[PDB]
């Protein structure tokens, strides 16, 4: 009872008066955050991309291959036969009431 067990030093540990506290921060705290950042926090800047979007400006867009003009099929491609037709084929004349006389003879072949 004369030493330890009896020592209850009103004063140790830096201090400790019932006080402290630890009045270090109680306020600035991670207020930058990790820092580095300086930003609105993605507030709002959607504007922001990394991607092309000149869809309707695709490749320097400057007519160089057709934009949009006539380039819906191109007479297409296939080959099949059955069709003959386009330049004028007959001419007929040659019957009807006969012009320049094609008729008033007949030697087949055989």
Not at 27 to 39: A, F, N, T
Not at 86 to 101: I, M, N, V
């Amino acid at each position: 009872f004369s030493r330890s067990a009896d020592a209850p030093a009103y004063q140790q540990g830096q201090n400790q008066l019932y006080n402290e506290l630890n009045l270090g921060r109680r306020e600035e705290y991670d207020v930058l955050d990790k820092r580095r950042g300086r930003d609105p926090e993605v507030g709002g800047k959607p504007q922001r991309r990394k991607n092309p979007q000149e869809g309707l400006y695709n490749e320097l867009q400057k007519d160089k291959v057709a934009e949009a003009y006539s380039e819906i099929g191109v007479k297409g491609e296939r080959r099949r036969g059955k069709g003959h037709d386009g330049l004028y084929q007959g001419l007929s004349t040659a019957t009807k009431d006969t012009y320049d006389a094609l008729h008033v003879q007949a030697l087949p072949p055989r």
